[PDB]
Design a protein around this ligand. Structure first.
Ligand SMILES: NC(=O)c1ccccc1-c1ccc2c(c1)Nc1ccccc1NC2=O
Length: 268
């Protein structure tokens, strides 16, 4: 079938090079095209690994000289970031559903030995049905290979979402770092604000949290059941921090809160 390989670039999705919303000339299928060294070669390689309903799908890549094109799943719902109302958050059942989907995605990634390393609401994309998808594997790396764990040492992520061990220790396990960023994402969804600039003793807000001053913001806006979960996630010691199998056993995580998607109905 002719022209099925042609895509029109219709809108800029952000700055990374750049990312464009591409529409197929024949089928009108929407895809996200990432337009760009060894850093992109690693992103393509990790993306070729990924196959999950809560992970942005990689369709392929093409090279045209110095320009590399990455064909990725387009998520029409945009970023989770824009579902968070400043200093308010979002309804608790929506945040619980987004957190369930975030956990399923992170369980998948850790299962194949991949750590994202930069989980934040700007990277958590939503599809047409508001299904959360983990995106941007530009800072992602392999932490388990041939069933052997590789401890990490590289400084990366975004400071409000980074685990405290990254700023304090030379080496750290990959998985508790992603669990921590997920907890900061959960905090943002329920309070509409970030708890600290960075998780260090020099940060008053971080010291207040370790001293359990939950009568202060953002913790005052958060109900006791999700707050009890945040108390288990945001634990300074990464070895004492709750693992994902135990997050799945938490009382709020298993609390019936949200109704299914409004399905059409008639009466009489
Ligand atoms: N998250 C990314 O991979 C990315 C990296 C750098 C710059 C932009 C993006 C990006 C890619 C795709 C989307 C996106 C940002 N966000 C977005 C914003 C508004 C509407 C739709 C989308 N969907 C998307 O699928």
């Amino acid at each position: 079938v002719p022209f099925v390989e042609d895509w029109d670039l219709v809108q800029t999705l952000g700055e990374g090079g750049e990312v464009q919303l591409a529409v197929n000339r024949v089928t009108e299928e929407a895809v996200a095209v990432k337009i760009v060294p060894e850093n992109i070669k690693k992103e393509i390689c990790i993306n070729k690994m990924l196959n999950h309903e809560n992970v942005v799908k990689f369709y392929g890549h093409r090279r045209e000289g110095n320009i590399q094109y990455l064909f990725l799943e387009y998520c029409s719902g945009g970023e989770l970031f824009d579902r968070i109302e400043p200093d308010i958050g979002m309804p608790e059942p929506d945040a619980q559903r987004f957190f369930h989907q975030l956990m399923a995605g992170v369980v998948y990634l850790h299962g194949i030995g991949i750590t994202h390393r930069d989980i934040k609401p700007e990277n958590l994309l939503l599809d047409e049905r508001d299904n959360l998808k983990i995106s941007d594997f530009g800072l992602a790396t392999v932490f388990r290979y041939n069933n052997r764990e590789r401890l990490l040492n590289k400084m990366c992520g975004t400071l409000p979402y980074v685990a405290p061990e990254l700023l304090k220790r030379r080496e750290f396990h990959a998985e508790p770092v992603d669990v921590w960023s997920c907890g900061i994402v959960l905090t943002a969804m329920l309070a509409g604000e970030l708890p600290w600039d960075q998780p260090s003793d020099s940060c008053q807000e971080y010291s207040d949290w370790k001293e359990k001053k939950t009568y202060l913001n953002p913790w005052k806006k958060i109900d006791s059941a999700p707050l009890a979960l945040l108390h288990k996630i945001l634990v300074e010691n990464p070895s004492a921090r709750i693992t994902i199998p135990d997050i799945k056993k938490d009382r709020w995580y298993n609390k019936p809160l949200k109704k299914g998607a409004k399905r059409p109905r008639v009466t009489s």
